[PDB]
Amino acid sequence: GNTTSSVILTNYMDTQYYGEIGIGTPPQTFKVVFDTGSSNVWVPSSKCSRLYTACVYHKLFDASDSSSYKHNGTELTLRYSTGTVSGFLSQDIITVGGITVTQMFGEVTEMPALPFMLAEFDGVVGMGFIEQAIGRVTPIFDNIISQGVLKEDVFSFYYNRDSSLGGQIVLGGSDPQHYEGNFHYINLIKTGVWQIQMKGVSVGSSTLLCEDGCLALVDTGASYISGSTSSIEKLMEALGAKKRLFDYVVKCNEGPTLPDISFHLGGKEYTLTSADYVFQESYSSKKLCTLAIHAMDIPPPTGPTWALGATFIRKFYTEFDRRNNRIGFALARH
Numbered sequence: 001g002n003t004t005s006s007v008i009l010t011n012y013m014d015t016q017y018y019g020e021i022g023i024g025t026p027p028q029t030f031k032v033v034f035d036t037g038s039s040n041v042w043v044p045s046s047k048c049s050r051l052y053t054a055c056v057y058h059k060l061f062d063a064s065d066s067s068s069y070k071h072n073g074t075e076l077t078l079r080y081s082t083g084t085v086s087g088f089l090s091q092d093i094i095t096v097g098g099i100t101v102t103q104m105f106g107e108v109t110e111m112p113a114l115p116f117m118l119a120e121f122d123g124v125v126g127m128g129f130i131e132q133a134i135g136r137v138t139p140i141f142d143n144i145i146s147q148g149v150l151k152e153d154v155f156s157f158y159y160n161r162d163s164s165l166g167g168q169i170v171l172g173g174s175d176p177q178h179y180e181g182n183f184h185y186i187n188l189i190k191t192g193v194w195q196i197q198m199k200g201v202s203v204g205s206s207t208l209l210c211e212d213g214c215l216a217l218v219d220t221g222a223s224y225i226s227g228s229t230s231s232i233e234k235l236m237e238a239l240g241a242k243k244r245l246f247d248y249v250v251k252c253n254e255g256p257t258l259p260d261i262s263f264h265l266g267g268k269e270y271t272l273t274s275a276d277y278v279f280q281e282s283y284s285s286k287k288l289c290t291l292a293i294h295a296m297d298i299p300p301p302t303g304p305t306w307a308l309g310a311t312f313i314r315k316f317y318t319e320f321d322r323r324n325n326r327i328g329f330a331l332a333r334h
């Protein structure tokens with residue numbers, strides 16, 4: 001076909017980038033993250049007890065209001081860090097920027113209060129492959145490819161810096177108005193996951209880490225750049241940053257003078273300056289500034305691995321190419 005479909009995103013504090021979908025007849029609207037590190041659609045269920053704080057603060061999907069709903073009822077579980085997210089399968093019609101698709105999705109009935117009660121959005125649309133789909137549920141972008149309608153079997157992300165357009169996802173192409181120059185591509189290690197080879201991470205001009213190669217998951221649903229606990233220790237030693245309980249910090253006045261960090265991917269070094277990875281909430285020496293880089297031990301089969309989240313995606317406009325199993329990067333225009 002010759003169609004593209006774009007969806008406007010909202011940027012909450014540089015950590016959450018979400019957009020609207022509609023599910024059912026008539027449409028029930030939900031704010032969702034479009035997430036390349038997962039393959040399932042999830043929204044909260046009207047069957048979620050009001051003694052879940054994550055449910056109280058969010059919109060709930062009610063099947064008993066949708067005429068196009070089709071029962072399934074198979075139980076689904078995700079074992080997240082803080083606890084289990086579980087629910088059940090349902091099918092309904094889902095709209096995403098003017099494309100309409102009959103989709104199997106999970107209705108959440110329980111989940112931990114953290115971090116989910118802090119989410120400004122209601123759900124998740126996984127943009128990953130059937131290989132990592134819980135219950136092998138056909139993922140949404142698979143069902144869009146099968147309709148024949150997109151101009152190219154690609155989708156792309158634009159994430160803005162905080163302030164205005166917060167971001168944009170385009171289905172079926174890219175939007176030239178939001179990047180400059182041309183894309184540079186890297187082949188997936190294997191289909192199934194949006195993960196590429198990384199050949200080195202540099203602090204300054206010398207290659208600090210990932211000497212004999214490693215893995216980079218390109219995860220639009222991650223807030224930060226993450227590496228293993230042991231790689232992040234070494235990066236933060238090199239940056240002179242201090243370990244807090246859930247983050248790393250530097251004295252705020254040291255912020256602007258921190259080294260460039262570079263990621264070696266395909267045939268380019270992708271560079272972040274301190275302006276790209278420091279949360280400069282002050283310039284004072286009496287205050288501490290958080291870094292947009294965090295340790296996460298990602299469990300097999302996909303990990304151990306780095307994750308390039310929104311920290312990375314903000315600077316580099318990203319295209320996810322299903323046709324050719326590759327990821328393209330271009331420098332974002334802000």
Ligand SMILES: O=C(C1=C(c2ccc(CCCOc3c(F)ccc(F)c3Cl)cc2)C[C@@H]2CNC[C@H]1N2)N(Cc1cccc(Cl)c1Cl)C1CC1
Pocket residue numbers: 015016033035037038042043044054055058078080085108115116118119120121122123124219221222223
């Ligand atoms: O941690 C994840 C990720 C993933 C994820 C996907 C689905 C789920 C299941 C349930 C989420 O549904 C939500 C929700 F995310 C938020 C609020 C809700 F009410 C619901 Cl039902 C949990 C985590 C998949 C993938 C690999 N791990 C890191 C990341 N990307 N999150 C949670 C998250 C990330 C960043 C900030 C916040 Cl506040 C949250 Cl809660 C979801 C947004 C993408």
Ligand SMILES: *[C@@H]1O[C@H](CO)[C@@H](O)[C@H](O)[C@H]1NC(C)=O
Pocket residue numbers: 071072073074089135136137
């Ligand atoms: C739910 O859908 C799945 C497809 O993954 C199917 O295998 C299963 O039988 C369905 N449940 C029922 C019994 O309707």
